Design a protein around this ligand. Sequence first.
Ligand SMILES: CCNCc1cccc2[nH]ccc12
Ligand SMILES: CCNCc1cccc2[nH]ccc12
Ligand SMILES: CCNCc1cccc2[nH]ccc12
Lengths: 245, 179
Amino acid sequence: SMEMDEKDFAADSWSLAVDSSFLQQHKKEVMKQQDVIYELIQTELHHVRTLKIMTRLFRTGMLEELHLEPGVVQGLFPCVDELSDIHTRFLSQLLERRRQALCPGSTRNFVIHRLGDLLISQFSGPSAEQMCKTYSEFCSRHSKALKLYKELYARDKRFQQFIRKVTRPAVLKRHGVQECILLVTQRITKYPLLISRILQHSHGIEEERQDLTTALGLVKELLSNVDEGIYQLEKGARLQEIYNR
Amino acid sequence: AIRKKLVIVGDGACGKTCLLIVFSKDQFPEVYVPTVFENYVADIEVDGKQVELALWDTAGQEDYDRLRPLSYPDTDVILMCFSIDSPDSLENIPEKWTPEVKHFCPNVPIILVGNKKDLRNDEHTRRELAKMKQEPVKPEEGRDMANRIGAFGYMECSAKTKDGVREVFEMATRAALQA
Ligand SMILES: CCNCc1cccc2[nH]ccc12
Ligand SMILES: CCNCc1cccc2[nH]ccc12
Ligand SMILES: CCNCc1cccc2[nH]ccc12
């Protein structure tokens, strides 16, 4: 993550991120709504950071330092560039909505009143088709990636040294290869929880309540479609095992 | 320091997300209670052994039967959660969660955890459950369910007061380290 965004999302909540004099100007219900929207954007910033660790630290490091067989890095990190493009674009839209909402003269005081429309756009049309296609592929290659990682770590000395070297810093404690893969897989199922709680505190404006209700429905449709398009790929599985599924 | 993986399973109302948050912060959040939990690696020392225990939540995966098992690979210990204020969450343990955990995590120890133990003697909880002809889960009912499902052990805790929380994770670490 870049320093500007890390600092903007350093506080545990929206109520602790904004100036206390600004916080005192809002009703209790607005603070509760803003705290949950802040959690969505903060967790999205962290999710994009997890994808940057996978693409830049892991994937690119193995290409530039190791002599792995062709197709090995792609097997370890399936669809990482596509996942990074989907979420970096979504994070850019969320951060632009926050920035436009800042008070003049402030880099921290803002209120987001219209999140619903942004969530409808992300979870519909071509962007939803791309999210569905990408996660159906990624989640179906999860077991194969984990199994290829384990074999490499146990049999390749230079691979083991590379992993131990790049994961040694304390800031990578939660982000080894398998941990990044599971953080990404679980990201999509966090959206309904966050959206329902934002909706709970967004009844003040009826158009906003309606938009978040539509967004929640679209996110659930996407998850059901992804869940239905998953079948774990297995290295060396014979056709007979597959057509007898 | 050896690395071990823990996954918590159970119904949404069981309070699994709150339990992971309270343990990882060693505090019930005073300003804001997070909606979600990403992951955490806790440094635990139990019976003189140092372990890095990775923590994972399954909240949000309950309705997705093909996404949910992706959380299970290489799990060393399972926390199977129910809420003491919800006999319905306890009934779903032998029917749904136990067969699933035994299939995807064979031979992995399961600790049955009764959450929200502070609500066992809460008058509002007793009045609300009495409308559906129910009452808070009794300690012996929890022990018997744990015995029946072949759990490694039975424990109770309250994420609200923090009582029993540390003990649950230190015992999970002990279970994860066994043969
Ligand atoms: C149980 C109701 N939650 C209250 C609350 C307090 C503080 C910040 C919050 N953000 C969303 C709900 C919220
Ligand atoms: C003062 C904290 N003790 C260090 C410790 C305890 C348990 C597990 C650990 N893994 C790495 C340090 C470590
Ligand atoms: C052969 C019976 N065990 C399969 C099983 C049990 C429980 C949950 C499950 N999800 C997918 C298979 C599955």
